Amino acid sequence: ELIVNVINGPNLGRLGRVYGGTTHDELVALIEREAAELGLKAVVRQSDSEAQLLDWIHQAADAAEPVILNAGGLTHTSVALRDACAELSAPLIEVHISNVHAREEFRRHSYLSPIATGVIVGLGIQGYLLALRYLAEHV
Amino acid sequence: ELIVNVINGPNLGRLGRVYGGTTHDELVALIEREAAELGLKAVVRQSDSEAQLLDWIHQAADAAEPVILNAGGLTHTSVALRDACAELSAPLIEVHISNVHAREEFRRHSYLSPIATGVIVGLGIQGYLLALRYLAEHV
Amino acid sequence: ELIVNVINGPNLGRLGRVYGGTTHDELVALIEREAAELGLKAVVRQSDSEAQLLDWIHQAADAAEPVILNAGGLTHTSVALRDACAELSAPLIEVHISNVHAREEFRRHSYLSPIATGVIVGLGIQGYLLALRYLAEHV
Amino acid sequence: ELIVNVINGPNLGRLGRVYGGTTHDELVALIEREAAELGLKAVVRQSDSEAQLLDWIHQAADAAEPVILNAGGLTHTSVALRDACAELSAPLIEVHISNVHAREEFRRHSYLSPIATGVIVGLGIQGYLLALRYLAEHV
Amino acid sequence: ELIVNVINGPNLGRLGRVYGGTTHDELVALIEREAAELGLKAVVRQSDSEAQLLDWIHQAADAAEPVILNAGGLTHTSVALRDACAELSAPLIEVHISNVHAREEFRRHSYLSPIATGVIVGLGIQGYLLALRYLAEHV
Amino acid sequence: ELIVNVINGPNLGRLGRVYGGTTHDELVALIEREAAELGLKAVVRQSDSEAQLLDWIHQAADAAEPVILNAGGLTHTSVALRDACAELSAPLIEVHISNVHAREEFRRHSYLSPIATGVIVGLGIQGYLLALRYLAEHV
Amino acid sequence: ELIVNVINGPNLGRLGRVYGGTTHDELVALIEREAAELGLKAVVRQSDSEAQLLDWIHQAADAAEPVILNAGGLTHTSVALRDACAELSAPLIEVHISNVHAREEFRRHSYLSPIATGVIVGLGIQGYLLALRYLAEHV
Amino acid sequence: ELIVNVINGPNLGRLGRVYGGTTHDELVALIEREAAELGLKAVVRQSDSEAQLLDWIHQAADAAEPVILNAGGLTHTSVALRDACAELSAPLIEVHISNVHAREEFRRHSYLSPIATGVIVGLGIQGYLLALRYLAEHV
Amino acid sequence: ELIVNVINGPNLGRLGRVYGGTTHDELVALIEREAAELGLKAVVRQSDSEAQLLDWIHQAADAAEPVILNAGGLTHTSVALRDACAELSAPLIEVHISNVHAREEFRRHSYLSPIATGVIVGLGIQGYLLALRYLAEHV
Amino acid sequence: ELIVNVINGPNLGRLGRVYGGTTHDELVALIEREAAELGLKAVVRQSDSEAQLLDWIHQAADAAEPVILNAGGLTHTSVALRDACAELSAPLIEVHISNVHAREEFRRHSYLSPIATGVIVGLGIQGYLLALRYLAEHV
Amino acid sequence: ELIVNVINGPNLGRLGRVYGGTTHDELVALIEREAAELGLKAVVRQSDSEAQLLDWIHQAADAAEPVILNAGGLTHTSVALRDACAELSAPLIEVHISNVHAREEFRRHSYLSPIATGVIVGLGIQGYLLALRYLAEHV
Amino acid sequence: ELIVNVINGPNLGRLGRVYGGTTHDELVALIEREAAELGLKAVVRQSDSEAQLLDWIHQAADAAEPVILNAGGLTHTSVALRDACAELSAPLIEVHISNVHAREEFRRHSYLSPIATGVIVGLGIQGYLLALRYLAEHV
Numbered sequence A, B, C, D, E, F, G, H, I, J, K, L: 001e002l003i004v005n006v007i008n009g010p011n012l013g014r015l016g017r018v019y020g021g022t023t024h025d026e027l028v029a030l031i032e033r034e035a036a037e038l039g040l041k042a043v044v045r046q047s048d049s050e051a052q053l054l055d056w057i058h059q060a061a062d063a064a065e066p067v068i069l070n071a072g073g074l075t076h077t078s079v080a081l082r083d084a085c086a087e088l089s090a091p092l093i094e095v096h097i098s099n100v101h102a103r104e105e106f107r108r109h110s111y112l113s114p115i116a117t118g119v120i121v122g123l124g125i126q127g128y129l130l131a132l133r134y135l136a137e138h139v
């Protein structure tokens, strides 16, 4: 179907001021533009609140919509986020802008990867665009 | 520039008979077709021999050409492969067809990821295509 | 005394749609019915927000009321939740609907168990009812 | 059906002289009284001999009768006990009188929990009674 | 410059009812009094909400103001908090009222210490005052 | 009372030629000046000899005088130093000039912290001055 | 010489009702038949009692007779069994019916293998027969 | 069917000059002789080249022929070898001439055992013969 | 008082045929002779049965008699033995004939030492005699 | 022969003001008295200096005299002390006054025990006397 | 005798374009020149193929010639290489050009060092020359 | 320049009575002779006192003279020694006479290697001579 949810977690609202010079609004505009090219509709949301993130994931579970998720630090710490993402019946693509394996050791474990469909790391902001293209070819 | 090397390691010659139903020749034809669309030239090679893989990586180092590398099992075991890939001055994108984080614990460490530019896992054969598209936008 | 607090953490609002087919409202009605049978009053609350959970625990600490707590994923990750529960002077019973020891290894550690009075796991929704009955016999 | 086996392992014969002031005979009389209230028949047995415990578990496997098991120290050490309990087709409820998570680190692993239906810890002698009530509601 | 942010995390609102008999309002009044003595202005804030804490840290990053941070339990669990604190360009002093090394083993790791300027533990409420004095000598 | 012992361990005699540009004699003069301001007497001693350090600690134990201790490398290696410091009945403040948590992993464990009153790290030479001020307020 | 002891440990009396459909008596009859073919005499014994197993091993030590040993769960837990088997001067062949390496991680360590002559796992009941044939060729 | 592949890995060409006095050609002649006795045909191959080993395993996968494999050092290091052996649909028997559990700790883990049918260790060269006999009884 | 229990666990009945050339009866006669010299009565018992050992320990707990215990392999494996020994109100001296620290790594942990009064290892059979002499001076 | 060296390491000079109320001089007088009873000569020495301890051990190595050694904290930290003690050709008995296994985890490893003849822990000051008696019976 | 084998493993053919500016041919010429000075003959070989390396080691084993070996990445990964080197009866000197202990943690373990005569690391290309000089003095 | 410091740590004064038959004075005479051949001056010092070793290292730091250091046991235990050696601006060569990797596991970690220029192990006393020759070629 058309709709794809792009969910960013804590601190991703500060993009542009490791993660590069593009701002979160620029990111939204890039995503929406690529999604229209692809025949999808992208709904892009960001929150520093875990409960707010869980609500958005819950809604994608009930609507059976795919999710492209950059959980930020919660990647490495939240079992609650993992359990909500485990209910999604449509694909889940875990995105990271930086290469989490070229940093601290503790960033090289994700609670999320074992239940995601796939993972894209280190490809910068284009990683989101590439995740979108995967989803457009997989319907 | 135009040229991109796609290097597959041991056992990837057997694709199609976890990794899906597409054969290695089909993979080559998909890659070459997408690369022409993108304005690149893809040189796709596969070997079960580590020394053969090292030679191909060496040549990409000397020519300063990017590499999209699916090292297979060597991902988790070869320091020699890592050291040769560390000499590449152009981007290196680590690809895995399956989600290595939804399998055995020992597949969740890569010698390669810390020196790659980025990593794509679990997106099937499309992961190669997406890696190509990253490289076409990054020249 | 009469009052018992039943606190559910993140994702437990979604019960019924591992954790079984009963909904969170059904759970509330089962608990309140069993508590009246037992001569207690049950106050049942659920939140995906850690701060909201901490507030409820704080209030039970100040009122010296017992707590039956199913913290969900926070069980395995929150030191903050643990520290607030450590102030309770009345009993704390840790409940889990599923058997956390028949799942992933990371679910077999609880920040909570060392400061709880006791723990009930794998007995489904009845675990809450049984926790209530323990508290009715222990006043 | 009516019958429930309550099996205590080594040292539980010494109850009453961490584990509280009730004796093993008092425990038997409490259990039998609660089981009659519930419409069940409780057969309560205790042994310091692992082979004797294995025989009792074997017999519950062949008769398809549920077991409430407090294995004492064997909880943390016996793979043999685990393997016999794994054959039970009726529910197995692991009971501990003390909170094993508020003690030594080595008491926080059980060979038994991964194959039990559920686990009750730290609720004192009432834990047995509560296990019985779970079984009476689950037939 | 004059301004110093003092940020307390979850449960620190309950001070006074390990952490001693002074209340959070008393703490605020002590800090403000010492800061005026020193020629600074202290802005003291407390929240049980991680997102609220992240917002305050974000604002100190944008204003280039120093932070004295007692994150409570989040010290040991939050990568998100760490990443926001890593953006601060002015000093960050990690404070703990209790000696975290004389307690549970899990309190002896901090996500925060590697990116802080310095750390003060076990000196009670005076630790905040001493952190202030460090900052007044370092401008 | 008036007297405070400031004990520096191996290599701290070389300060000034990570640890900054102030010399050990300058440090002594700074400490003595701040201690007089505070109404105390500071006795500052440095040795590369563990036995010499143990003797000084022994004497503070017998006199019931507080100690501010920067043990240098011995922090991470000496159980003997720990055991002598455990006899002190007056406060012990562990000081480190550098942030030991922003360095090698092996510097992030101290034999000393669990028996100290408190710990100050990364605040440079001022850490000693701040430790003094804690002791002047705590008599 | 002619005699070979075949010793089965706890739970192996229940064979036939992972370990397959053959019963312990059938196993005995298969072994005795193969041993006669080979010119040996097989003495096959089974016990759920560790002390009973130790006695049988002791007797093989004093008689200098080889042992084919399937210790069941005791494989992974008993140092006492290991020490008695270490006295055997004739060969000891450790047998397991299932593949212990395709199961839980804890089954992949044996106290016995380092002192055995050799080990056969995963070959079902034939493993015993093959162990016998090894011993008939090694006299 | 008749055919069984016996594959030896690196260094096994040097047998006879821990592993005993029989040469690799003697081993081949022993195997072929026992296989004819059993009504099978044994094809025995040895290589120090991992790629050569992978090719032989690939061919057994395509022909659906059983494999008796002594991978030598590759046992403990190769994920590539493991993945090729995982495709075999006929039985795989892992053989080791020495007892790998009476040696260095690092020899007590095999990448191969979890996907083999069964494993024979420490029975010398007879282990191959016994593996053959297992396969002759299992068709 | 006069009576001292000397309890030997599994395999110690075989002394004399690492542990030296003295037999268990010789050991008994040496102990009884030294105990009479010392004004005590020694009751020396040995069993390969854990339940039998637990019974003897239970009886020493009820009589408030000291125990000198060489548990053999059970030292390193039994939590049940530990828990029964923890009830003894008179001294418990753990004896080992061999030096358990000059052997396998797994012999360097004892479940028993943390609850014993003291431990004697590597002094051969004299260790028992020395334990007796400690008890004669400690009444 | 007659002579026995009793060597105490750091902090043991402070005995009497865990380790009990006897002073180091009292200890010396007790030892010398027991040694004369036994027909030996005891030379008792104590130092907080590792080099001084090494010299004394060196001299016992050259004279081939036994050593009873309580190294204090150095037990757990010094490889240098271990290597010098490894040269002794006469017996070495490691003594500890307290039970090192009922304390911190880090006290339960000794660099010394693997090269000692034997070890006595937790028997208080009598442990020295008992070590002497072992040596008098072993010449 | 005169002959010394110098064996370089994978990637060492690329020297000169961490490892410095000298090329592999320059290295060969330096070695041969120093070996003639010393009265030896140096045979210097390099391969990226493990099987090729094993063959060269095999030949040195059969000829009883010493080996100076820089295995590159295989140092840290190959058990096969280790086992072939373990057959050498003449000295084996492990050489590394860089300091492997000032790099990643995984480079600080060698499969080779425990069976080598000696190891030289971090001395650059001169390390080979120094290894030669050791061998010339040791015949 | 001409001068090279050769520093030996604890127990190396006892050479000659694992480490071979040459005495420390013989070692000094060998070193001085080789150093004169090379055009250097060797100053060779040995101490069992860590403080004495630190003083010598300090002096080499201030004079900018190279150091060849065999720290003995302190290699594996001293952070203080490491920190003083880290100040040296001229090369530091870590020498060990024995192969520390063919011994106990605990000898295979050095605090020193990560800050040394290079390391020579297992080449006996010649290792010192070879270290000298490295330094003569590196000025």
Ligand SMILES: O=C(O)[C@]1(O)C=C[C@@H](O)[C@H](O)C1
Binding pocket: A070, A071, A072, A073, A074, A075, A095, A096, A097, A098, A099, A100, A107, E079, E080, E083
């Ligand atoms: O987009 C990223 O690279 C990242 O997910 C963002 C924040 C961090 O906490 C993650 O480690 C990486």
Ligand SMILES: O=C(O)[C@]1(O)C=C[C@@H](O)[C@H](O)C1
Binding pocket: B070, B071, B072, B073, B074, B075, B095, B096, B097, B098, B099, B100, B107, H079, H080, H083
């Ligand atoms: O493409 C893959 O999924 C993989 O790289 C292939 C072979 C395996 O050894 C890797 O673990 C995953």
Ligand SMILES: O=C(O)[C@]1(O)C=C[C@@H](O)[C@H](O)C1
Binding pocket: A079, A080, A083, C070, C071, C072, C073, C074, C075, C095, C096, C097, C098, C099, C100, C107
């Ligand atoms: O109720 C349960 O079973 C659970 O507490 C709920 C959510 C999960 O995160 C816990 O692991 C188990």
Ligand SMILES: O=C(O)[C@]1(O)C=C[C@@H](O)[C@H](O)C1
Binding pocket: D070, D071, D072, D073, D074, D075, D095, D096, D097, D098, D099, D100, D107, I079, I080, I083
């Ligand atoms: O009932 C109990 O609390 C326990 O099962 C009894 C004996 C101990 O060994 C277990 O750890 C706890």
Ligand SMILES: O=C(O)[C@]1(O)C=C[C@@H](O)[C@H](O)C1
Binding pocket: C079, C080, C083, E070, E071, E072, E073, E074, E075, E095, E096, E097, E098, E099, E100, E107
């Ligand atoms: O101030 C403190 O001591 C602390 O930061 C407060 C709450 C706890 O979670 C930390 O461990 C310590």
Ligand SMILES: O=C(O)[C@]1(O)C=C[C@@H](O)[C@H](O)C1
Binding pocket: F070, F071, F072, F073, F074, F075, F095, F096, F097, F098, F099, F100, F107, L079, L080, L083
């Ligand atoms: O003052 C310091 O920062 C330190 O205590 C000095 C020397 C080092 O060994 C400690 O790690 C830190």
Ligand SMILES: O=C(O)[C@]1(O)C=C[C@@H](O)[C@H](O)C1
Binding pocket: D079, D080, D083, G070, G071, G072, G073, G074, G075, G095, G096, G097, G098, G099, G100, G107
């Ligand atoms: O025969 C077997 O497969 C086994 O020895 C029997 C019982 C289990 O406890 C062992 O893990 C395997």
Ligand SMILES: O=C(O)[C@]1(O)C=C[C@@H](O)[C@H](O)C1
Binding pocket: H070, H071, H072, H073, H074, H075, H095, H096, H097, H098, H099, H100, H107, K079, K080, K083
């Ligand atoms: O046959 C053997 O015993 C072995 O497989 C051969 C070579 C070694 O690397 C294995 O550890 C054992």
Ligand SMILES: O=C(O)[C@]1(O)C=C[C@@H](O)[C@H](O)C1
Binding pocket: G079, G080, G083, I070, I071, I072, I073, I074, I075, I095, I096, I097, I098, I099, I100, I107
């Ligand atoms: O007496 C002994 O040395 C020992 O207790 C006896 C049997 C073994 O299992 C223990 O490790 C040591």
Ligand SMILES: O=C(O)[C@]1(O)C=C[C@@H](O)[C@H](O)C1
Binding pocket: F079, F080, F083, J070, J071, J072, J073, J074, J075, J095, J096, J097, J098, J099, J100, J107
């Ligand atoms: O005698 C003792 O108990 C001890 O050896 C003395 C000092 C401590 O450092 C040891 O841990 C125990």
Ligand SMILES: O=C(O)[C@]1(O)C=C[C@@H](O)[C@H](O)C1
Binding pocket: B079, B080, B083, K070, K071, K072, K073, K074, K075, K095, K096, K097, K098, K099, K100, K107
């Ligand atoms: O020569 C060296 O420094 C090295 O052996 C070469 C390649 C790397 O893989 C080793 O870690 C070091």
Ligand SMILES: O=C(O)[C@]1(O)C=C[C@@H](O)[C@H](O)C1
Binding pocket: J079, J080, J083, L070, L071, L072, L073, L074, L075, L095, L096, L097, L098, L099, L100, L107
């Ligand atoms: O020279 C040596 O081999 C050594 O440095 C000397 C003493 C020991 O403590 C080191 O482990 C090795």
Ligand SMILES: [Cl-]
Binding pocket: A110, A111, A112, A114
């Ligand atoms: Cl996970």
Ligand SMILES: [Cl-]
Binding pocket: B110, B111, B112, B114
């Ligand atoms: Cl890595």
Ligand SMILES: [Cl-]
Binding pocket: A119, A121, B119, B121
């Ligand atoms: Cl990844």
Ligand SMILES: [Cl-]
Binding pocket: C110, C111, C112, C114
């Ligand atoms: Cl915990």
